[PDB]
């Protein structure tokens, strides 16, 4: 019955398109080699003779949550088993994404201080800082009457500010979502605000 040289095998790599068709690791027992489980969307290939595990597809932190766990067999017909942990580091490869490019119209009454508009949320598929999102208003607020809370994405008129329909009747605000990855990724959406008469 064949003896695996290591009790478990392990490697740590950055996810990304540079991983396609690279040799990750070679397992050895003392004889033919297979991956029998943990091979997510056929990411991996084993050389049946040489025992080298190659990435057929891009290593992806978002599919693996940072670790692929492969069950490998060695057979001559007696069989023995091990595990191959392919540990993956997260890179900033997902843009913070709003589900719609435009939402509107959101009604707001003139003549009242600090009314709420609505909450916007961009999703980021990355983890850690790479997945954390900061919100801002980057256009369409020429008098500085609005704020979006930078973590919670709540758009409101500033506390001690009242709108006035005759001054400005409609706003189209560009909202920016920026992640805390290096380099950072961002996207924008458009918010349509209609200002209502105090009747
Ligand atoms: Ca990825
Ligand atoms: Ca990532
Ligand atoms: Ca990101």
- Give CA–CA dist 106/170, Å, rounded: 10
Ligand 3 centroid to residue 122 C-alpha, Å: 10
DSSP string, the chain: ---BSSSSEEEEEE-BGGGTT-EEEE--B--EEEEEE--GGG-EEE-TTT-EEEESS-B-HHHHTTEEEEEEEEE---EEEEEEEEEEE--S-S--B-S-SEEEEEEEESSSBS-EEEE---B--S-GGGG-EEEEEEES-TT--EEE-TTT-EEEE-TT-B--TTT-SEEEEEEEEEESSSS--EEEEEEEEEEEP--
Cα dihedral 180, 183, 185, 186 in deg (nearest 10): 80
- Ligand number nearest CA of 180 is 3
Residue reference for tokens 């979006």: 148
- 170: its two tokens: 């409609």
- Ligand number nearest CA of 17 is 1
- 114: its two tokens: 């600090």
Ligand 1 centroid to residue 94 C-alpha, Å: 7
Ligand 3 centroid to residue 181 C-alpha, Å: 6
Neighbouring residues of 136: CB distance < 8 A, sequence distance ≥ 6: 148, 150, 175, 176, 178
Ligand 2 centroid to residue 91 C-alpha, Å: 4
- Give CA–CA dist 141/160, Å, rounded: 16
Buried b (16+ CB within 10 A) or exposed e, 149-172: eeeebebbbeeebbbebeebeebe
Contact (CB, 8 A) for 178 and 133: yes
Contact (CB, 8 A) for 77 and 2: no
């Amino acid at each position: 019955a064949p003896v695996f040289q290591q009790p478990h095998y392990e490697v740590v790599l950055d996810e990304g398109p540079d991983t396609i068709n690279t040799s990750l690791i070679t397992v050895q027992a003392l004889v033919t080699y297979a991956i029998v489980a943990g091979n997510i969307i056929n990411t991996f290939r084993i050389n049946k003779h040489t025992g080298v595990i190659t990435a057929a597809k891009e290593l992806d932190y978002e599919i693996s949550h940072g670790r692929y766990t492969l069950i490998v067999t060695a057979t001559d017909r007696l069989t023995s088993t091990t595990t191959v942990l392919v540990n993956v580091n997260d890179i900033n490869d997902n843009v913070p994404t709003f589900p719609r490019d435009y939402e509107g119209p959101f009604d707001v009454t003139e003549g009242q201080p600090g009314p709420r508009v609505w909450t916007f949320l961009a999703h980021d598929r990355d983890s850690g800082p790479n997945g954390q999102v900061e919100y801002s208003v980057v256009d369409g607020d020429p008098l500085g009457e609005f704020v979006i809370s930078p973590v919670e994405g709540v758009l409101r008129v500033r506390k001690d500010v009242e709108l006035d329909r005759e001054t400005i009747a409609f706003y189209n605000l560009t909202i920016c979502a920026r992640d805390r990855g290096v380099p950072p990724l961002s996207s924008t959406m458009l918010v349509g605000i209609r200002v209502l008469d105090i009747n």
